[PDB]
Swiss-Prot record, chain B:
Pfam families: Zn_ribbon_RPB9, Zn_ribbon_TFIIS
InterPro entries the record matches: DNA-dir_RNA_pol-M_15_CS, Rpa12/Rpb9/Rpc10/TFS, Zn_ribbon_RPB9, Zn_ribbon_RPB9_C, Znf_TFIIS
Protein name: DNA-directed RNA polymerase II subunit RPB9
Signal peptide, first to last residue: none
Localization per Swiss-Prot or TrEMBL: Nucleus, Nucleolus
Source organism phylogeny: Eukaryota, Metazoa, Chordata, Craniata, Vertebrata
Organism this protein belongs to: Sus scrofa
Keyword Ribonucleoprotein found: no
Length: 48, 114
């Protein structure tokens, strides 16, 4: 039956929507900002 | 506090007290030289090492190319609104990540921590 249906995999299966890329970049930027904040706290000696 | 050697015998000195006058008389044991103890102290030990690293940070680290450089936190003796910072990187001295700053002027070097 798979002869009829067939299966595959390609670049189209790895590309996501532009909105997804924007959300992912926003999440990464927020994470980087948060770790910058916590390392700043550690540098200034307030991390209990 | 420190350590002294001879005046005429170039040899190291131990501590000792005076049986008669009751005064700490640092006396050579390899020879017969003595002196009165002006300090009146014999031994000190800082096991936890409160002594901050500022007493031994070298000034010329400022002109190291590879360290960071921050514009804020200007120096005190001279304004010179740009300096460098770097962690202690000294195992067992203290478990405090306080950044150590040193001014980067050609002849300055006033060090501080904040
Ligand atoms: Zn001697
Ligand atoms: Zn300075």
């Amino acid at each position: 039956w798979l002869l009829i249906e067939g299966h595959t995999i390609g670049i189209g299966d790895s590309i996501a929507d532009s909105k997804t890329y924007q959300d992912i970049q926003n999440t990464i930027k927020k994470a980087k900002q948060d770790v910058i904040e916590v390392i700043e706290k550690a540098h200034n000696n307030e991390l209990e | 506090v420190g350590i002294r050697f001879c005046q005429e015998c170039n040899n190291m000195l131990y501590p000792k007290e005076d049986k008669e006058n009751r005064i700490l008389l640092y006396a050579c044991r390899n020879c017969d030289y003595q002196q009165e103890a002006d300090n009146s102290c014999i031994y000190v030990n800082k096991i936890t090492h409160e002594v901050d690293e500022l007493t031994q940070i070298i000034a010329d680290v400022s002109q190291d190319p590879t360290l960071p450089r921050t514009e804020d936190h200007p120096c005190q003796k001279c304004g010179h609104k740009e300096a460098v910072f770097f962690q202690s990187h000294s195992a067992r001295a203290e478990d405090a990540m306080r950044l150590y700053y040193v001014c980067t002027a050609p002849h300055c070097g006033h060090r501080w921590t904040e």
